[PDB]
Amino acid sequence: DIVMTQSPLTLSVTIGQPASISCKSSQSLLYSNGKTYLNWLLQRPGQSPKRLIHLVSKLDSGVPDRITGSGSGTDFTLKISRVEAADLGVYYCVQGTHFPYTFGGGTKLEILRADAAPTVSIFPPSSEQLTSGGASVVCFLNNFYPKDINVKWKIDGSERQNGVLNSWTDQDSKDSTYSMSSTLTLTKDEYERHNSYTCEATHKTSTSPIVKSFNRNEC
């Protein structure tokens, strides 16, 4: 089958700037009728893929002409003249010249914005959960940029690595930031044996770790 290679893996562009994506094939995509069946699709976050270009450079109906395509043989390029927030997502090139049809690995386009420091919230276990003999401490680190961040849990001054569950959202369309959730789960008994629970983060926006903690007690 034809192998399709896309470069780069990720593209980070500021709104208003141009973007370019490359797609290379293991066989020329020139069909025997002289047409080249190379398509470009966009899959927006949480949406089904949609075709942007067909026959190398022909735009599908309703697609903005800020987007253009070119190439021939084994080398193709998609260019976005001026990036807008709606361009965020993964772009794939897919060839239909050789059976079976094959796709490239995709290129994620991320909107490059001004650095944003996380807004951190920490939550102790609910009474409901404690009742069941479990205890989860949750930390939300909302709206930060860049995406690169390191979160560690510390209980009474010592780092806890077991029982941690992390999740991240994709880049937000509304403000181009990312959000993260980190949950530390322990037994009710152990939870009730410690005092200080700290959610600690490392991010570009700070020379020192960003901290959020609470001390559990009674009254």
């Binding site: 089904s48 109906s61 059976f99 569950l165």
Partner: protein, 222 residues
């Protein structure tokens, strides 16, 4: 208005089979090819096969011969894809699409896609989730604004649906992707409101886990 509606998420036992449906409307079903595409872990797309409902003519990617079987019901304008003897590699999201290439014209009409059907191949048991409210202590963000949360944990399989105030509250809501750990999923969502809204007015987390017919609402109280 051309539309393709796909069936709901499936949890299948290893070695069994399933039939996925793709109901179409808004166009002449028998006049266009319908293609099926597979997506694994995210960025990994593969072309499976295509069928021309008018004649029943199908073409398969060699890899899927014996794995996929396409059929189409002209009287109901529904295309089907049966997957046989399910295994690990079959867990994926499958899309049907009225791709739009018109061979005679050597050109294309607009492509329309179904929303996708997630298939999970596992022998793990269906488990209802426990919903926990998260009221601020330090995660109150001083004054001005306050963030609340909802912790959904210990369920199987995906998906679970979560809203705030029945969907009336969607601004400043962040719902995190479920993460699997020891055969169970955990998901969480946070909502930020102004100090003037909560606790004065109620904020409730609504959770639905279709697979276990669980519908639960949790009021976040101080």
């Amino acid at each position: 208005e051309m539309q393709l509606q796909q069936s709901g998420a499936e949890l299948l036992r290893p070695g069994t089979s399933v039939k996925l449906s793709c109901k179409t409307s808004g166009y002449i079903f028998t006049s266009y090819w319908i293609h099926w595409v597979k997506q694994r872990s995210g960025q990994g797309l593969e072309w499976i096969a295509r069928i021309y409902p008018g004649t029943g003519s199908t073409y398969y990617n060699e890899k899927f011969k014996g794995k996929a079987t396409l059929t189409a019901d002209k009287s109901s304008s529904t295309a089907y894809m049966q997957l046989s003897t399910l295994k690990s590699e079959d867990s994926a999201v499958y899309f049907c699409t009225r791709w739009g290439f018109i061979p005679v014209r050597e050109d294309y009409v607009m492509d329309y896609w179904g929303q996708g059907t997630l298939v999970t191949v596992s022998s793990a048991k269906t488990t209802a989730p426990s919903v926990y409210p998260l009221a601020p202590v330090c995660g109150d963000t001083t004054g001005s604004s306050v963030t609340l949360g909802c912790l959904v944990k210990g369920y199987f399989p995906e998906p679970v649906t979560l809203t705030w105030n029945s969907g009336s509250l969607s601004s400043g809501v962040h719902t995190f992707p479920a993460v699997l750990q020891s055969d169970l999923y955990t998901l969480s969502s946070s909502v930020t409101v102004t100090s003037s809204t909560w606790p004065s007015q109620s904020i409730t987390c609504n959770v639905a886990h279709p697979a276990s017919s669980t519908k639960v609402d949790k009021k976040i109280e101080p």
